[PDB]
Design a protein around this nucleic acid. Structure first.
Lengths: 60, 850, 146, 49, 834
RNA sequence: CAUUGGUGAGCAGCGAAGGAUUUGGUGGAUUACUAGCUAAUAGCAAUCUAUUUCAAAGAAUUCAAACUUGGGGGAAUGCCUUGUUGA
């Protein structure tokens, strides 16, 4: 629960189109479905490299 | 040499020139006051920020500088000047034709020494005067008393005594009485400098042979003779903290520190200033603090600190080496090329003949930097070439910058003299980039360019090969080749479509860039030297070799403007930001501002120094130029941003206003048979129709509270039948007498809408209906004049709103019906605009929707 | 009920609270009653700072009316009032051995023996002709720009 | 009312609204020139009704 | 085509600082949070200065000759403005915070209340050139104990009085010899004195304080000097005075209380003339006219400005901008009205020419999120988060229907058919494109088939099909008319949002989340061109950020696209600090615009300063609300998750800069972008640019006037378009006779037809020649109307401007011609009386 | 055979009296430069004291203020408010 705060503050986490940097954001029950990692980021590259799934045309 | 377009601002990029500067204590802080040529600057000590410059430049060079607590004393050709805050507060004139060389100030007695061995004494008239103004006396040093006056000093705790040092001896002058009181023994060497000391009655003398002779002026005997091997001594100062440190500054760029307690050396700083420009001209300690400020002819000003000792207990023996601190500087040479780094008119890139490249700032003069020539490591893993003993790059002759994509890769391409590759520079990192672009046909580069997108850079060889490189990998995309001589200019339009080039064969070659086809050729007569493209107006100009400027439209293949008149080679030129003007600097020391509509020069400035380059700012405020001599960059303010410009040919005179000022005022009416509106706001007709509804909306929702004990005539308390009729009513009565109402209708237009509704609803015509008839006949003449037709229609709309019941009650009367029918016979030819409007938007609806 | 409190001081002898208000009346306080104990109208305008001696016998008060007064708390009488000092005293404090400190804001001024009942020992900035009766400042220190 | 405001401004005011409503209104036959803020200009001239 | 520049900041009429009038009553200068806005309340024309300050404007004062304007930042960054030249003269940096600026009525020298000092400087001459050091200080007066908060010159030019944060207020003589005449110190106020004023005579001084006390100082006996004659009290129990002003000739005080009330007083009697109220906002700024009958009143926290004549109990303008909240934009078909959305639910029809709202629409409780126009601008639609999409009139100012969903889901965007029949809207929550009829308020169906929210929608103006931008990375084409009911997907690289479509109706412009902007063809579903966009975007590093601006993935995309009506250009705007204007077939940008320069906003800078990070915490992120002297701004009600909330006191940060809806103007070659700073309008209407077309050596401005002498009319006019200078075109256009108009207009070549129609539409809007210009419009449209029909999209910006000209200014003249004629026919031919 | 794994031995090529990493300290920018201090229309800066005191001015919420309370239930002793003895 603390390493999430580290990743949010470093600028990795988006809610739809835009990333939010303030970790004190209440996410709506509807809006809970859409929280992914931001694109072109090193927090996403490690996740896809373990799965052997990196499609770097989308520079992920 | 006066101008009607440009006016000088300042000289950006100068710090010092080589004159021995002065410093003045000011409370706790210090200010370092230097001079640059015909002006002078004031630098703070703790930050080296520029504080004040001279508001008005001196007529000649500043020879001597001295500064008291507040008042800086500058000494140019004949006169000395007392300045505060940069403002010329007082000008003190020397009543002699000789030139002032040294300027000492102590007490109420200013001490000005001319070059022909005469010392002028200036006295404060009042003992509480802030500067000396009256002329006391004229001391004279003959040829039997000594040589020329090397310096004027005033030693501490001497009552009205002036210490004069010649080339052979030291003299004293009781300036209250003007009498010599003591002469020193002859010094066999030529004394070059003088300085007082924190010890009493002690002056330090430095000779041309490296001897520091330390003359006790009370006993008249020297004390310490410090020997320096064969070095010309220029500067002398003492560290007044309490530790015994003597700073002697050679003209060979060396700074030697002596510990007078232990009779030993401390440190010999090497090459703090260049040899050829004078070396260490003036170097002094700040009074009581271990910060020494040095300056020379190399256009730089450095600060060095003596750090506290590493040993906790020993102290005085193990003294720290001097250590570099704050420094401001410029080029040691005059600057060759100048460009602009951004559209905000903030940064100016200047490459000089001092083998360097600086990024000056027009906004803050302490923001300047020397852009680093430290090469990046090669991507291959192979070691790069060049000397191990590092030297600077060769002199840069052509430059190009694109500000579109900055900081993500290299955005400057600079072209050096006699080098077969151009070099990349990153403006944001302020560092030479990691790519060099070879011509690949064995050729020096004579012109470079950028695309406006910033991805593509164009390189022009000396053998015609226009190679096109890329910015990311430095890889070579295309190699165009059309010429046989050296390519002397490349550009590209905004669209990345039309690529233009020009060489010494007179060929202007138009290329397409999306495909790889030659669009066309344009052969001229003379060879083409330089070319500046204006991307907004799609016009590029060429500086030809028949001493003319030819402007060619980039799309329509042909010469569109041709300008003649320069008596020598057009050195450099640049377009106006709006494309209206071309400025051009030529070798006959003239600068001409051609106007591209009229095809003629509108301002000719005979600048005294030959201008190598001119360059407009992308913002329309600044004209930047560089001269043949002078290390700085002269900046001219564009006076077109304030005052309108008369486009008049003026070149033959030095060496209707509607068309001249390029503003055409509209006519009041084209012809009498037109139907033109009134001069003013178009919503004046809207307020006259609906005056009641607008105020009723604009009233507040509730009634505001009032203290009902107010004075009744508080509006008339502004703190500062025939005779009582209004000025309109008298004019309406006079209008019926003279049968003319054009005097009446002039006041009817200019009245306020609230005044008009007061005027129309109160016409004082109820029983005889006379002023109704006069006002109707006034508006028959108004519609017959056909001006202000929108207003005159709304005036009887307000008449029929107010007295519509009045004229309906007395309808069919033969006088009122005659006036109204005479208005309809005028109004019968006012359906022409109705037929015009009902036609025009029916076509406009049908054409646009089909 | 006297606006915002603008000054704090503890009496070491008595543990009563002293309160400088915007009305210019310093008010003694104690948690035994919800009423103020005494109310001394010291200076006009507001009261900037107050300080009480270790003896619990003397207090100094100052405010933005360019005034500074010395009070004896036991009889609620001012021993001597100093008026027309150049800048208003932002801070006052009394040492253990009766050395009164006054902070004009860029300056720090100290008066020795400016507390006792005699009218000669009224603190002052000078003495005409070396008159020994006036209380010259014990030590003044100038700060740079603070 | 102020709890709903304090909930939505805490919720990054993307917010699920009320289900439905059906109310009654009245409309005074004012000139449409006087159904706006104070201004030297307008665009309508006919009645509100 | 690409020489755009800033010309008007529509909206945000007043933000903070010192509102002022001109020396005449014409111009009203209001401090907007970046720059000075110059409105004119007599000749209804607005103007916003093109220069940008670095932070918020603290104080503004104009010279009494109307020539020099000084605008001073809150950190003391003074900027001179040559007011008639509308350019910058100098950039001074006063070292402290300045609070009040006032020139002398002579105008030779001005006084500055910065810090605890009063600085008196001599104003530079306007006609002198731009020198390096134009400012020379007369004196500095330091006789005060706290910050100076107000400044007031004399009716003469020799006495300056200042009231400070300390309880005193002092009169300082600007002449050295008159120091003995005016050196006394007025004090005795119980609280913050924030205004003193000389009377109509030099004798009396009335000082106004925060506690409600007005002191009248008179030079008399119990020699004798400056007693108090009488004190007056406002008796506002919890309302405190915020600022005051006093015109001495009409002896009027106008006080501003923080509750919202303002009162008008006559000073030798102290009688309350009028007391009105705005609302709950503090009256932050009060100023008076030079003639003393116009009062400019302004509040900050709602951003409203109110100019009110004190004599007649009636306003002149009550306008109210809204900071940070303009979610969307919609132009009118005529390029004179721009409406906008708000977070308050307000839909406000602003006017281009004067920067004030015409009408307001507050019937949405929730925030309005998308605003569009339909069917010649008479009807208009708006989507909100309230669960409804509401139609509106612009003739009766009322809703027709309030369309809703089956369960009141939220809404993101709105689109309308060009015929007023179908409305549609998209949602974050339900992500089905609901459609309604305009006539029947029931919804027809739910066009579904998407995974994730439909972001943007738009109907085609010719084919009448709709395109849906969705977070499914798919562009969906729905042919919903005439038995088709077919669905065509065009899938793209990444999360596509902010669709736009050409006025030709055969292309789709979209903005992917990856940064790139793709352009398709609707009928032929292949991709016909993409433009990369990631490099030319300024993603500002926020002060709360913990990453560089390079890899800041926050705002390196575009969330707004609109085509040009010519079909030749695309303006892309986004969450970033940049507005870009791309060219469609040439793949490359034209020029890039920086929307704002404000560290009051968050993302104005890629490079933050290194003297702001201490060893812990950024210096500007330190909550400094406690150092304030008041109570209401000390109160912090900041919720933790108030990212784009309902207020600004709940934010706890500074607002971020973004542009969110950009549309081209349909008439006058401009485009308006709804920004954080308000509603920026960039325009090219100044036309100071040498744009040629097929020039030659012989053709000159001398050849233009000479061709008018020998009456070669078509040779003069066509070769005037060769230079394309506006005064050169205006010279030949107003000089040719009426009978030679149709012969000239019939033989004008096809190249110069878009130039003449752009000139006539631009010039005739403000020109007195209705009859001459409409003769030219008749002759041009009846001799070359076939070509304009054959190329509609080349002329559609100019052809809309011409029919704007006949409707907006030329039709109501015909209306008054008909109305006067008909009421004359009635009054002279019908019944008598009795 | 691939290794898109690490560790080591070399070569081709790059290659001007060395070159790679890695790191401490300091200086200059990171918004557009009108100088220090004070009691300031002036003085100091080597100080304001044996010149800085008197005079003049200066008192309304007539005896005013938590706009700053997590929620539920109370409140004995407290505190607040309104009625009940004596100067």
């Amino acid at each position: 629960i603390q390493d999430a705060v580290k990743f949010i503050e470093q600028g990795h986490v988006r809610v739809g189109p835009n990333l939010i940097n303030d970790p004190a954001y209440l996410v709506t029950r509807n809006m809970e479905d859409y929280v992914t990692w931001v694109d072109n980021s090193k927090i996403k590259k490690t996740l896809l490299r373990y799965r052997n799934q990196i499609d770097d045309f989308d520079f992920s | 040499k006066n101008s009607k377009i440009f006016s000088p601002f300042r000289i950006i990029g100068n710090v010092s020139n080589g004159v021995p500067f002065a410093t003045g204590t000011l409370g706790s802080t210090f200010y370092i006051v230097t001079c640059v040529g015909k002006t002078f600057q004031i630098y703070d000590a703790n930050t080296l920020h520029l504080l004040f410059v001279s508001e008005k430049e001196t007529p000649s060079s500043i020879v001597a500088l001295s500064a008291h607590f507040h008042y800086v004393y500058a000494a140019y050709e004949n006169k000395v000047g007392i300045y505060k805050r940069g403002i010329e507060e007082h000008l003190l004139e020397l009543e002699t034709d000789a030139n002032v060389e040294h300027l000492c100030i102590f007490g109420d007695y200013l001490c000005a020494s001319t070059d022909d061995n005469s010392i002028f004494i200036y006295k404060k008239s009042d003992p509480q005067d802030k500067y000396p103004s009256e002329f006391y006396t004229k001391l004279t040093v003959t040829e039997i008393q000594g040589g020329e006056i090397v310096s004027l000093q005033h030693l501490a705790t001497y009552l009205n005594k002036l210490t004069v040092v010649t080339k052979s001896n030291v003299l004293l002058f009781n300036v209250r009485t003007g009498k010599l009181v003591f002469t020193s023994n002859e010094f066999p060497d030529q004394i070059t400098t003088a300085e007082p000391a924190p010890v009493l009655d002690i002056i330090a003398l430095g000779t041309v042979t490296g001897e520091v002779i330390m003359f006790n002026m009370r006993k008249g005997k020297r004390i310490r003779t410090i020997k320096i091997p064969q070095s010309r001594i220029s500067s002398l100062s003492f560290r007044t903290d309490g530790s015994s440190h003597l700073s002697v500054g050679t003209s060979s760029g060396d700074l030697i520190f002596y510990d007078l307690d232990r009779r030993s050396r401390i440190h010999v700083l090497k090459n703090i200033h260049r040899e050829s420009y004078g070396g260490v001209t003036q170097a002094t300690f700040l009074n009581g603090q271990p910060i020494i400020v040095t300056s020379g002819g190399d256009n730089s000003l450095k600060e060095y600190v003596f750090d506290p000792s590493l040993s906790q207990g020993s102290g005085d023996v193990v003294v720290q080496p001097p250590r570099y601190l704050r420094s401001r500087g410029g080029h040691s040479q005059p600057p060759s090329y100048i460009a602009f780094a951004d559209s905000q008119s903030h940064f100016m890139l200047s490459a000089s003949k001092d083998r360097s490249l600086w990024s000056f700032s027009l906004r803050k003069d302490a923001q300047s930097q020397e852009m680093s020539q430290r090469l990046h490591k090669k991507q291959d893993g192979g070691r790069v070439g060049g000397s191990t003993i590092k030297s600077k790059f060769p002199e840069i002759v052509a430059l190009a910058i694109e500000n579109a994509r900055i900081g993500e890769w290299e955005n400057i391409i600079t072209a050096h003299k006699d080098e077969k590759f151009a070099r990349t520079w990153d403006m944001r990192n302020k560092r030479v980039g990691r790519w060099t672009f070879d011509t690949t046909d064995d050729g020096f580069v004579k012109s470079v360019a950028m695309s406006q997108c910033g991805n593509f850079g164009f390189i022009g060889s000396s053998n015609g090969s226009i190679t096109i490189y890329n910015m990311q990998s430095g890889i070579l995309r295309k190699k165009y080749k059309l010429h046989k001589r050296a390519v002397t200019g490349i550009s590209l339009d905004g669209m990345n479509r039309k690529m233009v080039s020009c060489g010494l064969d007179g060929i202007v070659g138009f290329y397409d860039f999306n495909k790889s086809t030659l669009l066309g050729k344009l052969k001229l007569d003379a060879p083409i030297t330089a070319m500046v493209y204006h991307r907004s107006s799609d016009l590029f100009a060429l500086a030809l070799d028949d001493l003319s400027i030819v402007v060619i439209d980039a799309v329509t293949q042909r010469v569109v403007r041709q300008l003649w008149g320069h008596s020598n080679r057009i050195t450099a030129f640049d377009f106006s930001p709006e494309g209206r003007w071309i400025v051009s600097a030529s070798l006959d020391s003239t600068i001409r501002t051609w106007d591209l509509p009229t095809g003629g020069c509108i301002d000719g400035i005979i600048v005294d120094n030959v201008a190598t380059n001119v360059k407009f700012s992308p913002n329309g405020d600044l004209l930047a130029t560089t001269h043949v001599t002078g290390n700085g960059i002269c900046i001219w303010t564009n006076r077109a941003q304030f005052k309108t410009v008369s486009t008049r040919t003026i070149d033959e005179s030095e060496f209707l206003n509607d068309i001249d000022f390029n503003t055409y005022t509209s006519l009041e009416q084209i012809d009498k048979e037109l139907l033109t509106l009134s001069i003013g706001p178009r919503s004046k007709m809207n307020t006259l129709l609906h005056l009641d509804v607008i105020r009723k909306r604009s009233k507040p929702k509730e009634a505001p509270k009032k203290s009902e004990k107010l004075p009744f005539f508080l509006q008339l308390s502004g703190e500062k039948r025939l005779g009582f009729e209004s000025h309109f009513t008298k004019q309406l009565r006079e209008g019926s007498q003279s049968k003319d109402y054009s005097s009446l209708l002039a006041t009817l237009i200019n009245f306020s809408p609230a005044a008009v509704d007061l005027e129309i609803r109160s016409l004082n015509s109820f029983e005889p209906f006379d002023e109704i008839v006069w006002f109707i006949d006034a508006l028959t003449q108004g519609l017959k004049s056909n001006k202000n037709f929108e207003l005159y229609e709304t005036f009887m709309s307000l008449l029929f709103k107010a007295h519509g019941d009045v004229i309906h009650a007395n309808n069919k009367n033969q006088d009122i019906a005659s006036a109204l029918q005479n208005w309809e016979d005028v109004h019968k030819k006012e359906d022409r605009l109705d037929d015009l409007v009902k036609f025009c938007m029916g076509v406009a609806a049908f054409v646009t929707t089909a | 009920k006297a606006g915002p409190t603008m000054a704090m001081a503890q009496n070491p002898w008595n543990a009563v609270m002293h309160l400088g208000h915007s009305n210019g009346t310093v008010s003694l306080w104690s948690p035994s009653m919800p009423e103020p104990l005494v109310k001394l109208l010291s200076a006009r305008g507001p009261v900037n700072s107050i300080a009480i001696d270790r003896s619990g016998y003397y207090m100094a008060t100052t405010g933005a009316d360019r005034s500074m007064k010395i009070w004896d708390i036991r009889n609620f009488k001012q021993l001597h009032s100093v008026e027309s000092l150049p800048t208003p005293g932002t801070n006052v404090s009394i040492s253990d051995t009766g050395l009164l400190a006054l902070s004009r804001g860029p300056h720090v001024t100290l008066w020795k023996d400016a507390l006792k009942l005699s009218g000669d020992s009224k603190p002052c900035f000078g003495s005409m002709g070396g008159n020994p009766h006036r209380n010259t400042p014990y030590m003044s220190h100038l700060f740079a720009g603070n | 009312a102020n709890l709903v405001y304090k909930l939505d401004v805490l919720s990054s005011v993307h917010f699920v609204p009320k289900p439905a409503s059906t109310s009654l209104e009245i409309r005074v036959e004012t000139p449409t020139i006087s159904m706006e803020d104070a201004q030297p200009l307008y665009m309508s001239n006919a009645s509100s009704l | 085509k690409s020489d755009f520049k800033f010309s008007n900041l529509l909206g945000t009429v007043y933000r903070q600082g010192n509102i002022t009038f001109s020396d005449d009553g014409k111009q009203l200068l209001s401090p907007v949070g970046n720059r000075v806005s110059v409105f004119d309340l007599i000749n209804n024309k607005s103007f916003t200065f093109e220069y940008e300050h670095r932070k918020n404007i603290a104080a503004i004062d104009l010279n009494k000759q109307g020539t020099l304007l000084i605008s001073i930042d809150e950190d003391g960054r003074a900027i001179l403005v040559n007011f008639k030249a509308r350019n910058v003269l100098h950039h001074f940096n006063f070292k402290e915070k300045c609070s009040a600026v006032k020139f002398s009525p002579d105008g030779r020298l001005f006084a500055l209340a910065s810090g605890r000092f009063l600085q008196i400087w001599k104003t530079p001459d306007v006609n002198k050139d731009r020198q390096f050091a134009p400012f020379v200080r007369h004196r500095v007066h330091a006789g005060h104990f706290q910050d100076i908060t107000s400044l007031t010159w004399s009716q003469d030019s020799r006495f300056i009085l200042t009231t400070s944060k300390d309880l005193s207020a002092k009169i300082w003589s600007v002449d050295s010899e008159e120091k003995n005449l005016a050196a006394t110190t007025f004090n005795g106020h119980r609280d913050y004195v924030m205004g003193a004023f000389f009377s109509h005579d030099q004798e009396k001084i009335y000082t106004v304080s925060k506690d409600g006390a007005v002191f009248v100082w008179e030079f008399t006996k119990r020699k004798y000097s400056w007693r108090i004659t009488k004190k007056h009290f406002f008796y506002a129990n919890q309302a405190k005075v915020k600022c005051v002003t006093f015109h001495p000739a009409t002896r009027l005080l106008a006080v501003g209380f923080t509750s919202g009330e303002f009162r008008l007083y006559d000073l030798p009697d102290f009688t309350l003339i009028q007391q009105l109220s705005m609302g709950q906002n503090p009256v932050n700024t009060v100023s008076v006219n030079q003639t003393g009958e116009w009062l400019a009143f302004g509040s900050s926290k709602l951003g409203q400005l109110l100019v009110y004549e004190w004599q007649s109990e009636s306003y002149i303008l009550k306008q109210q901008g809204h900071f940070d909240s303009t979610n969307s934009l919609a132009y009118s078909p005529d390029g004179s009205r721009v409406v906008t959305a708000s977070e308050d639910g307000k839909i406000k029809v602003w006017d281009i020419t004067s920067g004030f709202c015409l009408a307001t629409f507050e019937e949405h409780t929730s925030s309005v999120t998308a605003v569009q126009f339909a069917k010649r601008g008479q009807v208009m639609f708006s989507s909100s988060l309230d669960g409804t999409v509401r139609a509106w009139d612009l003739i009766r100012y009322r809703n027709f229907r309030t369309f809703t969903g089956t369960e009141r889901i939220q809404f993101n965007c709105l689109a309308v058919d060009p015929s007023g029949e179908v409305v549609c809207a998209g949602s974050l929550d339900n992500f089905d494109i609901h459609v309604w009829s305009v006539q029947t308020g029931q919804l027809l169906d739910a066009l579904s088939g998407h995974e994730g929210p439909v972001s943007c929608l738009s109907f085609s103006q010719e084919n009448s099909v709709l395109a849906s931008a969705s977070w499914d990375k798919t562009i969906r084409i729905w042919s919903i008319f005439g038995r088709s009911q077919q669905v065509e997907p065009i899938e793209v690289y990444s999360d596509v949002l902010a669709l736009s479509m050409r006025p030709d109706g055969k292309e789709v412009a979209v903005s992917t989340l990856k940064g790139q902007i793709s352009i398709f063809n609707i009928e032929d579903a292949k991709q016909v061109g993409n433009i990369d966009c990631r490099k030319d975007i300024i993603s500002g590093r926020f002060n709360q950020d913990r990453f560089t601006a390079k890899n800041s993935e926050r705002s390196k995309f575009f969330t707004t696209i609109h085509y040009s009506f010519d079909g030749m250009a695309i303006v892309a705007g986004g969450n970033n600090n940049s507005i870009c204007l791309y060219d469609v077939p040439n793949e490359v940008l034209l020029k890039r615009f920086i929307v704002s320069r404000n560290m009051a906003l968050n993302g104005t800078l890629e490079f933050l300063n290194s003297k702001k990070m201490t060893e812990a915490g950024s210096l500007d992120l330190i909550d400094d609300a406690g150092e304030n002297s008041d109570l209401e701004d000390r109160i912090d009600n900041s919720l933790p998750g108030s990212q784009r909330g309902g207020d600004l006191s709940t934010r706890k940060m500074r607002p971020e800069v973004r542009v969110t809806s950009v549309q081209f103007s349909p008439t006058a070659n401009a485009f308006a972008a709804a920004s954080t700073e308000g509603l920026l309008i960039y325009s090219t209407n100044d036309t100071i640019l040498f744009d040629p077309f097929d020039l030659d050596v012989d053709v000159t401005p001398h050849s233009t006037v000479e061709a008018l002498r020998e009456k070669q009319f078509l040779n003069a006019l066509v070769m005037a378009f060769r230079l394309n200078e506006e005064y050169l075109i205006n010279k030949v256009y107003e000089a040719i006779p009426i009978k030679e108009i149709p012969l000239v207009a019939s033989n004008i070549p096809a190249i110069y037809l878009p130039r003449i129609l752009k000139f006539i539409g631009d010039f005739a809007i403000e020109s007195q020649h209705i009859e001459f210009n409409l003769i030219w419009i008749k002759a041009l449209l009846s001799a070359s109307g076939g070509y304009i029909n054959e190329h509609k999209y080349l002329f559609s910006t100019a052809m809309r401007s011409i029919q704007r000209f006949i409707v907006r200014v030329a039709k109501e003249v015909v209306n008054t011609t008909t109305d006067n004629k008909y009421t004359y026919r009635f009054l002279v031919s019908t019944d008598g009386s009795m």
